[PDB]
Amino acid sequence: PADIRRATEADMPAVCTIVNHYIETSTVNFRTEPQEPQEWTDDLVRLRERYPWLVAEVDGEVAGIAYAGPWKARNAYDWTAESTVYVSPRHQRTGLGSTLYTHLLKSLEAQGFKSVVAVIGLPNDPSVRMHEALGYAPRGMLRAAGFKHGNWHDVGFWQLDFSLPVPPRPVLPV
């Protein structure tokens, strides 16, 4: 059993620990410096009313995070969100990522977003397969765009499209 719920400030140290592990050990993101919980909490409090920030809690512990934010700082992009998801290494492939994203995506759809973009450093078969299983389509890839872990890595963009009319209404808060 798992509670997918809105993330709180108290969850952020655990989230920071999870994501830092992947920063250190994975090329799925191209960060090469760990983050501090303060940055996570600052971002949460700044964005959580506009974008869904969700955690999966299992047996009282934070086991995963999924969150959205703006894609690019232009008004024209207001209906385009970025999504991110990390599940604790002890909790992989138990459906948490899917559940987190289903809740995330349903929120963004109801809020009136046009689409959601996922940036995936490659190769990362689990993330690619999970994103495609949830309806994201591969939209292209920049070759050898990042140097991390001693090699050049491609970065791919996946996108899940919603239907909106012309013109779109301003998006709703969470």
Add this chain to the structure above:
Amino acid sequence: ADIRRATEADMPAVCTIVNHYIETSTVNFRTEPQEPQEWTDDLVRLRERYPWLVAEVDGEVAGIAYAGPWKARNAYDWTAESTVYVSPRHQRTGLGSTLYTHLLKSLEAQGFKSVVAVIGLPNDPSVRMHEALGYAPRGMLRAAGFKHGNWHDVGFWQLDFSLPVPPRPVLPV
């Protein structure tokens, strides 16, 4: 015509050119006019590590091509973004491609790995110019922007260089 390094004195004229396209076109997805200070700030911050070039015709700024960081992670340090705008008075007289030729020669010699151009679509003139200079289409987000009454796709084009593994730091201009 002159192809030379961009200076702070050029920035109001550049800002005026790009603001015209912001106002009248969807070739970029900004909706609000920019102030020249935004241009000056980026020029001052970037001009030592990235080429910023202006075309000058009959003594007036006629276009700009400039590069900057693709993304603010150190892993992207060898990946540049390129951008080019020519005044509507000076379109299709070789300035854009000449500017880019110089820009690209610099980025290659400085030791970048690749250059990425972001093209709000449709923009046949820009796609044609980029592909003629060796950029390859690398993908496209659908309906990523809403501007001037319609959804617009945005495409990414990339020109690849080659570097050893590991790369050395990029050289300054």
